A = this chain, B = another copy of it.
Amino acid sequence: SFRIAAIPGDGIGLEVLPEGIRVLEAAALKHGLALEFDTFEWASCDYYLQHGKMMPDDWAEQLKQYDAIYFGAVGWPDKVPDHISLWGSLLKFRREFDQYVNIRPVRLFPGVPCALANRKVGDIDFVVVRENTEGEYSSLGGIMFENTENEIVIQESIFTRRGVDRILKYAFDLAEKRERKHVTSATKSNGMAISMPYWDKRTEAMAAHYPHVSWDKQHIDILCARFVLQPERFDVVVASNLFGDILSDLGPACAGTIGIAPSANLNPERNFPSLFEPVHGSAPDIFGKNIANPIAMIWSGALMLEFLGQGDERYQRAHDDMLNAIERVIADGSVTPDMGGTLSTQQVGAAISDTLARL
């Protein structure tokens, strides 16, 4: 008996969430899976406008009593400053729930358009392992000599032995379990003269632990190009918070698009609920036009299943299914405008809704 917390948040969160739930309830009934959903108004800019705070003070004790989070997106600069909204909701989720891994599997699905030249289709496959607790995402620092010629602004990056070690481990593992078993650590150990060399110190230190696994270390600029221009190289790519919510948009949209970009925010020791979300944001530019690609949002529930079940081949089943459901509709051509289709958001929700049965 599972319990799932669903939060559409802002913008297209409301839009793509019901079509994530939809294609999931299909497998639920279809495979005898204990999926008992719920919806929460907070973690939105409506809630913030109304209450002064992004969520109620007791959000956690609330959520702690659930198995997983199915999250939409958060942000509406029109009405709420972006830091306020991310820090006040999602950031507190990942943070106070110790979901230190943020993964973003990157792939070309049979027949997806290519914003890269003539690569064999499917010859692209890897995951991106993003530090999600610390690093360059901070609230530390402040403004000095405010409003004067001499104005200074400080921002601390904080790297610790724990967050780094643990995210570095969880990457000599997702490679310890693959065909290539290769790792590229991202760094900028020429620019940053204190943080990155350290990161490299610990990268290097834990290569000595998995001697069969093969690793290199590429400066985030080149890595970004190599990302677009030679995605066959990469198997595992491990990175700091910033070198996470970076790449995340580039990659899943290196050739394809950010509409088909899944992400997972994980607490491996299960001591807290993990959270599942697409890579994209609230996209105010597109909201209420139901044209938004819900694949990322779907792919997300799939991963929610894949992770969530653990000890069942039962839940495992559902994943592959749903990704094939994705896979068909892709080449079947029932897609959203940011991929070719003339279809709508719910259209593409209903298009997946079919294939799951047909096979």
Contacts and interface: CB of A to CB of B under 8 A. Distances in A.
Interface in A158-202: 158-162, 188-198
B190 A75 contact: yes
A194 B241 contact: no
A131 to B, nearest CB: 12
A241 B191 contact: yes
B113 A188 contact: no
A357 interface: no
A82 B220 CA distance: 14
A13 to B, nearest CB: 15
A47 B158 CA distance: 34
Given A115-B229, A246-B220, A82 B241 contact: no
Contacts of A247: 221, 224
A292 interface: no
A142 B145 CA distance: 18
A225 B241 contact: no
A160, A190, A242, A249: most-surrounded residue (chain B CB, <10 A): A190
Given A139-B142, A142-B140, A115 B228 contact: yes
Given A117-B113, A250-B225, A195 B153 contact: yes
Contact of A85 (B87, B134, B161, B190): B190
Interface of A: 75, 81-83, 85-87, 96, 113-117, 134, 136-145, 147-162, 188-198, 220-222, 224-225, 228-229, 241-242, 245-250, 253-255, 258
A75, A148, A156, A160: most-surrounded residue (chain B CB, <10 A): A156
Nearest to A141: B194
A144 B140 contact: yes
A148, A192, A197, A221: most-surrounded residue (chain B CB, <10 A): A221
A114 B118 CA distance: 10
Nearest to A161: B151
A155 B82 contact: no
Contact of A152 (B115, B160, B190, B248): B160
Nearest to A221: B249
A194 B139 contact: yes
Contacts of A190: 75, 82-83, 85-86
Contacts of A149: 161-162
Contacts of A242: 188, 191
Given A140-B144, A193-B139, A156 B154 contact: yes
Contact of A225 (B144, B152, B225, B249): B249
A100 to B, nearest CB: 12
A228 B250 contact: yes
B144 A134 contact: yes
Contact of A136 (B115, B191, B224, B229): B191
A138 B250 contact: no
A75, A155, A192, A228: most-surrounded residue (chain B CB, <10 A): A155
A139 B154 CA distance: 11
Contacts of A156: 141-142, 154-157
Given A161-B151, A198-B143, A229 B245 contact: no
25 contacts: A75-B190, A83-B192, A83-B193, A86-B191, A96-B147, A115-B116, A117-B255, A137-B191, A137-B192, A139-B193, A140-B141, A140-B142, A141-B142, A141-B194, A142-B142, A142-B156, A143-B194, A150-B162, A152-B152, A153-B198, A154-B154, A154-B194, A155-B195, A191-B245, A229-B253
